[PDB]
Amino acid sequence: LGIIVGIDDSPAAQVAVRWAARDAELRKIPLTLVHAVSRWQQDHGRHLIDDALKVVEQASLRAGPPTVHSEIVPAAAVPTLVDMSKDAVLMVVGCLGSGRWPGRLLGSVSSGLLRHAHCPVVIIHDAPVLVGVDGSSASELATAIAFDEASRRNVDLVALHAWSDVDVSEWPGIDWPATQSMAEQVLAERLAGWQERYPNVAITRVVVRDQPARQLVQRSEEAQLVVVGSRGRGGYAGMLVGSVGETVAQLARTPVIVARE
Amino acid sequence: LGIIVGIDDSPAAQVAVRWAARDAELRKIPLTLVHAVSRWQQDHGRHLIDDALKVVEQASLRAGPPTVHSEIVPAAAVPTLVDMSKDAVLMVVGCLGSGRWPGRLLGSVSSGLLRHAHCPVVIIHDAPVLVGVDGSSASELATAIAFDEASRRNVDLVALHAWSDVDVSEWPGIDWPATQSMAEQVLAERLAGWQERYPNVAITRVVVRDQPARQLVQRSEEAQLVVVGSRGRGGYAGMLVGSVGETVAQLARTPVIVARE
Ligand SMILES: *O=[P@@]([O])(O[C][C]1O[C](N2[C]=NC3=C2N=[C]N=C3[N])[C]([O])[C]1[O])OP([O])(=O)OP([O])([O])=O
Ligand SMILES: *O=[P@@]([O])(O[C][C]1O[C](N2[C]=NC3=C2N=[C]N=C3[N])[C]([O])[C]1[O])OP([O])(=O)OP([O])([O])=O
Numbered sequence: 139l140g141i142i143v144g145i146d147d148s149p150a151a152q153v154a155v156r157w158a159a160r161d162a163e164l165r166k167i168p169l170t171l172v173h174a175v176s177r178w179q180q181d182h183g184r185h186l187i188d189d190a191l192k193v194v195e196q197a198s199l200r201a202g203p204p205t206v207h208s209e210i211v212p213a214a215a216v217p218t219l220v221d222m223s224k225d226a227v228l229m230v231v232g233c234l235g236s237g238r239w240p241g242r243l244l245g246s247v248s249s250g251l252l253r254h255a256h257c258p259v260v261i262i263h264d265a266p267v268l269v270g271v272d273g274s275s276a277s278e279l280a281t282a283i284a285f286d287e288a289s290r291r292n293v294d295l296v297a298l299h300a301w302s303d304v305d306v307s308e309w310p311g312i313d314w315p316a317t318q319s320m321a322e323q324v325l326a327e328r329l330a331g332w333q334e335r336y337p338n339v340a341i342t343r344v345v346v347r348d349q350p351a352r353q354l355v356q357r358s359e360e361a362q363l364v365v366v367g368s369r370g371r372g373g374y375a376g377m378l379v380g381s382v383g384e385t386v387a388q389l390a391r392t393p394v395i396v397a398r399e
Numbered sequence: 400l401g402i403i404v405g406i407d408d409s410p411a412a413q414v415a416v417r418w419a420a421r422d423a424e425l426r427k428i429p430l431t432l433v434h435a436v437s438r439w440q441q442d443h444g445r446h447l448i449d450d451a452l453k454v455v456e457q458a459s460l461r462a463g464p465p466t467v468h469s470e471i472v473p474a475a476a477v478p479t480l481v482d483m484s485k486d487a488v489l490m491v492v493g494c495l496g497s498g499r500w501p502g503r504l505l506g507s508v509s510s511g512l513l514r515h516a517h518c519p520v521v522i523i524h525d526a527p528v529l530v531g532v533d534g535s536s537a538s539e540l541a542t543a544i545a546f547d548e549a550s551r552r553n554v555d556l557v558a559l560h561a562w563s564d565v566d567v568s569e570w571p572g573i574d575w576p577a578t579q580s581m582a583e584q585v586l587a588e589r590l591a592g593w594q595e596r597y598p599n600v601a602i603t604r605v606v607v608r609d610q611p612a613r614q615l616v617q618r619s620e621e622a623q624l625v626v627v628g629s630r631g632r633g634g635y636a637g638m639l640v641g642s643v644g645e646t647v648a649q650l651a652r653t654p655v656i657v658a659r660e
C-alpha cells in the first residue's frame with residue numbers, strides 16, 4: 139500500500155524517492171520502499187534503505203508520510219514489484235539503475251513494470267502537468283490521474299492531442315487548419331466533463347498534426363509531470379505497452395506516470 | 400519464404416536490404432520484400448519497392464537471388480510481418496524507421512518483432528561473427544545460427560560468455576581468476592560439439608566477469624555480425640524478449656540476429 143518505490147544503488151532511484159516522498163505526503167498514504175534481490179547482499183540492501191530514508195527526511199516538508207515502510211525481499215525484482223503493485227496506488231521506479239551505461243535508457247525492472255505492473259507506473263530520471271490524450275479509454279485513466287494530480291499540486295494543466303498517430307501526413311491536400319480546429323473542439327468537449335469536477339486548475343489544450351511523442355516529450359521541458367496511458371487507439375495483439383508510452387517514458391525530462399490496469 | 404525484409408522510407412531500412420540481399424544470395428533462398436500500411440499510400444509504397452529493388456541490384460554480386468519477391472500489403476506492419484515470419488528463414492528489419500528522432504533507438508515494428516516474430520529477427524542500423532552464449536537453450540539456437548552463418552561466410556567466429564548476469568560482482572573474495580578458467584573450460588566444452596561440425600571456422604572463446612551486453616555490444620565494433628537469443632537463463636513470467644537481447648540489438652554497431660521460436 140501507498141506509493142511503492144523500488145530502490146537500488148543508482149542516482150535515478152535516489153531521485154525516485156524524493157518524488158515518491160512528496161507524492162505520498164500530498165496524499166495521506168504510506169511511502170513503502172522495496173529493494174528486491176536475486177551476505178554482502180543483505181548488508182548492502184541495508185545501506186540502500188538507510189540512504190533511501192535519509193532522502194525522505196530531506197525530501198518532505200511538513201508531515202512526513204503517515205507511514206514510511208521499507209522491506210528488503212530476497213526475490214526477482216520484477217516479480218516482486220509487479221505483485222506488490224496490485225495493492226499500491228502508484229509504482230515509482232528510476233529509469234536506469236546501477237548497471238546502466240551510455241546508449242541505454244530503460245532496464246529489466248523499469249521495462250518490465252511498464253509492461254506488467256498493476257498500477258500506474260512512474261519512471262523518474264535525473265509547474266503544470268502535461269497530458270497525452272486521444273480519448274482511447276486507456277488515456278481517460280491518464281487524464282483522470284493528471285487532474286487528480288494537478289489538484290493536490292495546486293497548479294495548472296496542459297492537455298495535448300495529436301491528430302494523427304501515423305507520422306507524415308504528407309498526404310494530399312487535407313484541410314489541416316480546419317480539421318485542426320475541429321479536433322480542438324472535440325478535445326475541448328471531452329475535457330469539459332473534468333473542467334467542472336476540478337475548478338482552480340486551468341485547462342490549456344493543444345492540438346498538433348503529427349508525432350505525439352516528440353511533442354509530449356519535448357514539451358515536457360516546461361511542465362513538472364507528464365502523463366500517458368499504457369495503451370491507446372491502435373496497437374497490435376500481444377502488446378504490453380504503447381510504443382508512444384514507452385518512448386515518452388524513456389525520453390522525457392520530467393517524471394512520467396503511465397496509467398495501467 | 401526466404402528472408403523477408405520489411406521496408407519503409409528510412410535509411411536504416413535501405414541498408415536492411417543490402418544485408419538481406421547478400422544473405423539470400425549466400426544461401427539459395429528467395430529475397431522477399433514486404434511493405435505493410437494502415438491513394439498516395441499505394442503510389443508511395445510503389446516507389447519504396449522500386450528503390451528497394453534498386454538496392455538489391457547494387458548489393459548482390461554473382462547470382463542475384465533465385466527469386467526476388469516483394470509485396471505491398473494493406474495491413475498493420477507488425478501483424479503482417481509476425482504472421483509472414485512463420486514461413487521465413489529470417490526477418491530483417493531496420494532498427495529505426497521513418498518517424499525516428501534523436502533519443503529513440505527502436506520502433507513499433509522492430510520492437511514488436513523482437514517480441515513476437517516466429518523466426519530469428521535481424522535488426523540492422525547504419526569479418527568474424529560474435530556470439531553471446533550462456534548455454535541457456537535459447538542461445539544454443541543462436542550459436543547454431545552463428546556457425547551456420549560463419550560457414551557460408553567463409554570466416555572466423557568469436558564466442559563470448561560472461562560469468563555473471565548480475566552486474567557487480569563486487570561480492571566477497573570469490574576467486575575470479577580460477578572461476579574464470581573453469582568457465583573457459585566449460586565454454587570450450589560446449590563449443591566442441593560444433594567445432595567438429597564446422598572445421599575451417601576458428602572458434603575464439605572469451606570469458607568475462609560481468610556485464611554481458613556492454614561487451615557483446617562494444618566488441619561488436621570488431622566483428623561483422625552479432626548473434627544472441629531472444630531469451631536466456633533468468634527472465635521473468637510474461638517476458639517476450641531478453642533485456643540483454645533487446646539492449647544489444649538497439650546499441651550494437653553491426654547487424655544483430657536474435658534467434659527465436
Ligand atoms: O499509441 P500508443 O503508444 O499511445 C499510448 C498512450 O500514448 C498517448 N497517446 C497516444 N496517441 C496520442 C497520445 N497522446 C497524444 N496524441 C495522440 N495522438 C496516450 O496517452 C496513450 O495512453 O499506444 P498504442 O497506439 O496502443 O501503441 P502504438 O501506437 O505504438 O501501436
Ligand atoms: O539475459 P537475457 O537478456 O539474455 C538473452 C540472450 O542474451 C545472451 N546472453 C545472456 N546471458 C549472457 C549472454 N551472453 C553472454 N554472456 C551471458 N552471461 C544470450 O545469447 C541470450 O540468448 O535473457 P533473460 O536472462 O531471459 O532476460 P534478463 O536477463 O533481462 O532477465
Ligand SMILES: Nc1ncnc2c1ncn2[C@@H]1O[C@H](COP(=O)(O)OP(=O)(O)OP(=O)(O)O)[C@@H](O)[C@H]1O
Binds near residue numbers: 146151152175234235
Ligand atoms: N533489485 C531491485 N529492487 C528494487 N528496485 C530496483 C531493483 N533494481 C532496480 N530497481 C529500480 O528500478 C529501476 C530500474 O532499474 P534497472 O535495474 O532495471 O536498470 P539497470 O540496472 O540499468 O538495468 P539492468 O538492471 O537490467 O541491468 C531503477 O530506477 C531502480 O530504482
Ligand SMILES: Nc1ncnc2c1ncn2[C@@H]1O[C@H](COP(=O)(O)OP(=O)(O)OP(=O)(O)O)[C@@H](O)[C@H]1O
Binds near residue numbers: 406412493510
Ligand atoms: N509499414 C511497414 N512495412 C514494412 N516494414 C516496415 C514498416 N514500417 C517500418 N518497417 C521496417 O521496420 C523497421 C522498424 O521501423 P519503425 O517504423 O518501427 O521505426 P520508427 O518509424 O522510427 O518508429 P514508429 O514507426 O513506431 O514511429 C524499419 O527498419 C523499417 O525498415
